[PDB]
Ligand binder design. Structure first.
Ligand code: ADP
Ligand code: ADP
Ligand code: ADP
Ligand code: ADP
Ligand code: ADP
Ligand code: ADP
Ligand code: MG
Ligand code: MG
Ligand code: MG
Ligand code: MG
Ligand code: MG
Ligand code: MG
Ligand code: MG
Ligand code: MG
Ligand code: MG
Ligand code: MG
Ligand code: MG
Ligand code: MG
Ligand code: MG
Ligand code: MG
Ligand code: MG
Ligand code: MG
Ligand code: MG
Ligand code: MG
Ligand code: MG
Ligand code: MG
Ligand code: MG
Ligand code: MG
Ligand code: MG
Ligand code: MG
Lengths: 293, 293, 293, 293, 293, 293
């Protein structure tokens, strides 16, 4: 019993000492590695990640079918980073960025560095150079599948990239539509699981993200949220549901209320209220994070 | 005659003395090695295994095509072990565990240890460390085919692992989609042999498991059962068929009855009755096991 | 002339005296060594072997591509031996025996001894121990190619094995997919040379076995027969063709007849008739053997 | 001049007296030792050998890559010998003789003596015993490379063998895929130098044999012929070419004619004509031999 | 000074009187012993030999790796000798002479004497008998390494051979792949130092011969030339280079010219011109020899 | 004390008077016999020899494994002698001299006398005749081990040779790969102790020479230097190290400087500078010699 508990603790400790704190974990442990993170723009996903956002200095992979929300997520990560004065770069092989939508999500387009590489090797070399500069905080590559080998147009790189990103504390996200599978500290499976309709017209998509790999906190948690056309992740909608779940917001059938006052009849109205009262929303969000992180 | 019977008995005895009781057996012998086991969650498979479940302290291999039920089986083994207060670990290289489905199968996710190794060598070293701790009862590796060599990403280990697992009495299961082939005490070939439909819609799969290698009891026995989507192995369905086979449950055409009373018209209803009357089901299961083990 | 005939007879006699009766032979001689044999389940192969089956106390090798019929042949040898009350053992390194198919071929699975060795050395030692017991009549090793050396997993043996098998009169068959090449008294090359179709669907395979080495009777004879899925060697089909060849069964174009009566139109129907009239079939088989052996 | 011619003649005569007529020769001399021979089945090779076939009482080596035609040649030698009522033996270590193909080549399989020795020493002892009998005319050993030493399975012999073969006038051919190199009177290098196609399908092989050692006539001559699948050496094709070369058969562009009459348009048709008119073919063959031997 | 010059001249003279003119030499002396020679077929090698070819009545050794050009050289020596009406003999232990290639090199195959000895002792005795005849001008032994001692198959000879060859003025060349090392008057080290390609395909080999021992003229000179497949030594190519070196042929960058006229652009074309204009080539060759010999 | 010092001085003096100045010495004495010498081409070895080079009129032995640098050393001795107008002879039994390499080392090949003796006795007699001429300054015999006795091919000499060499003041070096051991005044043990690489490719060998016997100065000193392929002993490299050792050249970490100016960064560059500025190099060399000799 106690003897076995001590033997297990020691064994797990030796494993962590040899391979790192995130090398083995109990799926239910409420502990996370002390790591600097950048918000994904989704409250439920920041919670599912355990650390409250994506880890700096690491490689992250986000994959899923076209239109599942990969680009939207990375643009919101960039916006979050830029708000904190961080320098971001976008390595593009898709040729599909919409600056109007990006600005809507909060991205400072004017200060976003961008490269549209001729070959996959050039793209990786540019990433490594930005990584080695110690002056770039976030790099987004969209997408992996578009990176065509030079030889074709006419593993070793990943190892060096990972090392350089770690040394400079640079977060790098690969959007994908074994090297990456193994070098990534976080891998996200994102998919559209339904449509959001304001009556009879489709205005967005119901989205689900599974954290299939997580080396900074317990893996396999999931997040669900809506992505509204031209607006991005419906953060306040997530806050309504999580506020209720943590018993910070009461739901009397269809009426939602906070601290004894109604904020809206129906999730849509409750969401709008939080959005129009950001100072209070920030307090609820802060409370939710303290409880679930 | 008698002289030859004694010569054969002595020869087989010498073989067993030199290489172990399971080194040679008569395929029809109703004897099994005294070994501690953990249920697979399938009554027919526990029977096919001869010992009533998978043997602790040994290496087991379960292989078959994608979606044949390998993960489902290992999760039900984990659930069975945890119910008995055993400590389990999941070494993942697939990045595909669904905790919602796992909890449905009975797994205590919160207490499940999990590791997502960077390389095949790291995965094996972690297994060995858990094995040497003497504090881990069940280790599941999913999957063998995903374990990529470090050198690639940028036999000797099996021998030590097997020895350590034996010393600590730790069961280790490798999911695969010559080292393993020879070090494993039990090897299971699992495959989907049909679809289960509740009318016009597919709700599960007809499954067949062949015990192709068994060093704890006679090999080559087979098990057949259904795996229902979101529910796992249809144990009560197996109990209906085995109860009838052992003449514990009578089948009057389409009506099934127990001790003179009808439990259901059609296998589906009979199955539901056993499921809703677990105390009686446990008695029938106990009877079946005593007769076939 | 006569002087040369006597000189040749004496020389051949001296060779046989020094190395054994089967050390030299005329390929056309209708003489075979007096040796106890076990049927292969194929009438044409028993004939091609010259002695009417495989020789007890000797080593036999059967090799050919996967699915050529090696296992089927050895299972039918086991069934034939068991029918005569002989004790058989199956040394398995393939982990692929199907007891349902085996029982269909006539094998008494319950009484079949089985070993699934960890290493090639262990397998050979088990064979030798069974050989030295004087209580095992037939040993089948499947397969040679799967016997991995212990050193790898982490000639001298053949000599002793051959001697022990001879002393106990134990037949041992090695299934293979220079030691064996030279120690074997019979070596069979088996291959699939076509498909058998009952209309538009494949129901079996056309098979050809060449006796490439034979130390008990003249080598190089061949046998041709069908192996039907789930049924094994089509013995009665061979009997139809051989009965006709030896003029015991008449064939009037498409109609086959025996002793003035039609047994079937087309080989398939004639085969079915013999199968349903075993007492007569046994007489024809006996006649064929007396004529060709 | 004349003095030097006489000195050379005397010196060569002394050499021959001391070591044998074939100890030294002028490569262009049209003289051959009076020796009994057996045809190889190839007209060009019988010519290249100088004596018209292989010499009895001597050792011959035929070597070349697999499928070059070694076995085919030896089987045709056996057929030629048997046609003359000679007794032949086949010492086999290859376990690959096809009696159907052999009969096609003219071999009297029923009367062919055969031995499949356990060791290289046993094979040589059997050869020597057959050699000493004075009752065996031709011995073929296939192959040298397969003769494994007893010690391994668990020069002095060649000297005695050669002496015994000489005394009994027995021809012995070793098929190989320094002892032999030096004891052999004839050594043949055979190789496939192309494919023979009847349109778009391969039906045979273009073959070339070099007489690299010849102690009965001038060495280094070459022979070229085709070996057709299932038929053996295309003798009549050689006869067409040699008949033309010796101006016995005229070739008017594509039309071949004999004694003023066309026998075929194209080598294939001319060959067929000779084959269908053997009595005339034999006369042409006889003429060619008288001119080139 | 002068006194020392006279003392040295006398000492060297006494040495030569006691051991022979070639017993000591100045490496740069442009003097050679008056000896009859036979061309090697290589202009640069005849020059490197100092005497203009190999010396008659002496023993010569030519050694080097397989395919370096040893046989080619000896065949060209034989061709040169035969052109002058000399009688040549080939003592073969290699069994590899190609008469087609030999005729291409100029060898009169029909008149070439050949022996294929059973033992090394027999080969040497045959050489000695040919040597003592006084009727053989050139003897080539290929090869030394193949001469196996009789005792094995089941110095003193060299001394007698050398004496007999000297008395009859017979040149003997040993091809090798201390007796010979010391009895030989000339020893040649030949090796392939590159490939000759007519574009992208290999058509020959770049060859280098070092005169490591020379008792008829200064040793250690070297020769470089090409050996073209099926053609032998590229003599005209050597003539182009030597003609230029001796300023008999002018080279204006890539254009070669003789007596004011262009003979070709590039060495290949210049070579072809000399080959097609042999009467002029012979004059240039004669000039080169007079200057370098 | 003083009495003992005088007794020792007298005793050593009597020994020297009776057997020669070099019959006994203090290993540390900085005195050497007044003897004419010829440089070895190695500055460190000339220093280790004590006299500044090899002594004329004496016998020297240089031995070591193949490729240790024996021939290179003797060729550089010959070059040094010839530069001073001395007459040199090369007695060869190796048949391996490369005149291209020799000229590179400074040897005047054209004026080098050379003999390639048939027997060991002939070689020694030629050496003695050259020795007695009083007109040869340096004789090199390569090698001792190759000198085969006449009797074999089919001490007393050393005594006379030594006497004659002494009388004529002729230096004779025996290259070896008790007579010599005792008659030699200097014996050198040379060996390769490493490889010299210009990056990743081997360009030379690190060499060590031990003066194991020295009758002209204190024995047992050692020399270390590099031998570069195609260039010989790296003299300037030795000068850099010795210049530094004697504080004539300063080394500031990696920078070498002379008289206040940098000559190169790294030994390689410093070496190159001395090589390109021979007039200064000669002054440094002269200084080093005055200090260490
Ligand atoms: N340019 C855009 N303008 C308005 N909405 C957009 C735009 N791009 C994406 N969206 C919204 O985001 C959802 C997911 O798109 P996106 O993040 O581009 O998917 P992915 O990169 O996975 O293909 C869309 O269904 C849409 O509602
Ligand atoms: N996450 C899941 N949710 C619901 N059913 C599942 C889930 N995973 C597996 N199953 C059920 O189990 C069956 C076999 O799946 P699984 O055990 O994952 O196969 P394998 O691991 O061999 O690929 C599926 O066909 C399905 O019915
Ligand atoms: N389990 C089985 N069930 C039904 N038929 C089988 C089975 N195993 C073999 N057969 C039949 O035998 C044929 C040859 O198979 P087998 O004897 O196993 O080949 P091998 O051992 O040479 O690989 C198959 O093509 C099939 O018709
Ligand atoms: N059993 C056979 N049936 C038909 N043709 C054969 C057979 N064996 C050999 N041949 C023919 O002879 C050619 C050479 O075969 P073979 O004499 O066996 O070669 P080797 O003995 O040198 O390996 C083949 O390419 C084929 O055309
Ligand atoms: N039979 C041949 N036919 C065509 N070229 C040949 C032949 N034999 C030799 N050669 C040419 O001569 C070169 C050297 O061969 P050879 O003189 O036989 O070498 P060695 O006797 O030293 O082994 C070959 O690389 C080839 O270009
Ligand atoms: N012919 C040559 N060409 C270029 N370098 C040579 C030559 N001969 C010797 N060397 C150089 O001298 C080193 C020693 O060779 P050498 O003096 O011949 O050794 P030894 O005579 O002791 O066998 C070689 O490792 C090589 O670097
Ligand atoms: Mg670490
Ligand atoms: Mg941890
Ligand atoms: Mg996108
Ligand atoms: Mg561009
Ligand atoms: Mg990681
Ligand atoms: Mg044991
Ligand atoms: Mg047992
Ligand atoms: Mg799975
Ligand atoms: Mg085991
Ligand atoms: Mg016997
Ligand atoms: Mg017999
Ligand atoms: Mg099988
Ligand atoms: Mg045998
Ligand atoms: Mg004789
Ligand atoms: Mg002759
Ligand atoms: Mg063959
Ligand atoms: Mg012979
Ligand atoms: Mg003389
Ligand atoms: Mg001279
Ligand atoms: Mg050659
Ligand atoms: Mg000589
Ligand atoms: Mg003295
Ligand atoms: Mg002294
Ligand atoms: Mg040397």
């Amino acid at each position: 019993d106690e003897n076995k508990q001590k033997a297990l603790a020691a064994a797990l400790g030796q494993i962590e000492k040899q391979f790192g704190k995130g090398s083995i974990m109990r799926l239910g442990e409420d502990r996370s590695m002390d790591v600097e993170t950048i918000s994904t723009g989704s409250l439920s996903l920041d919670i599912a990640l355990g650390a409250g956002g994506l880890p700096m200095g690491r490689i992250v992979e986000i994959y899923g079918p076209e239109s599942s929300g990969k680009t939207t997520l990375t643009l919101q990560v960039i916006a979050a980073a830029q708000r904190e004065g961080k320098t971001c770069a976008f390595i593009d092989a898709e040729h599909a960025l919409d600056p109007i939508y990006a600005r809507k999500l909060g991205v400072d387009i004017d200060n976003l560095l961008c490269s549209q590489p001729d070959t996959g090797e050039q793209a990786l070399e540019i990433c490594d150079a930005l990584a080695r500069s110690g002056a770039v905080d976030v790099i987004v590559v969209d997408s992996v599948a578009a990176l065509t080998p030079k030889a074709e147009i006419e593993s070793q790189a990943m190892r060096k990239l990972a090392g350089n990103l770690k040394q400079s504390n640079t977060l790098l996200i690969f959007i994908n539509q074994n090297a990456l599978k193994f070098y990534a500290s976080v891998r996200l499976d994102i998919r559209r699981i339904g449509a959001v309709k304001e009556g009879e017209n489709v205005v967005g998509s119901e989205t689900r993200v599974k954290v299939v790999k997580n080396k900074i906190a317990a893996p396999f948690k999931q997040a669900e949220f809506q992505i509204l056309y031209g607006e991005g992740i419906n953060f306040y909608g997530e806050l309504v549901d999580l506020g209720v779940k943590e018993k910070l917001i009461e739901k009397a059938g269809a009426w939602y209320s906070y601290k004894g006052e109604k904020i809206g009849q129906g999730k849509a109205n409750a969401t709008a209220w939080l959005k129009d009262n950001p100072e209070t929303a920030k307090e609820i969000e802060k409370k939710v994070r303290e409880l679930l992180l």
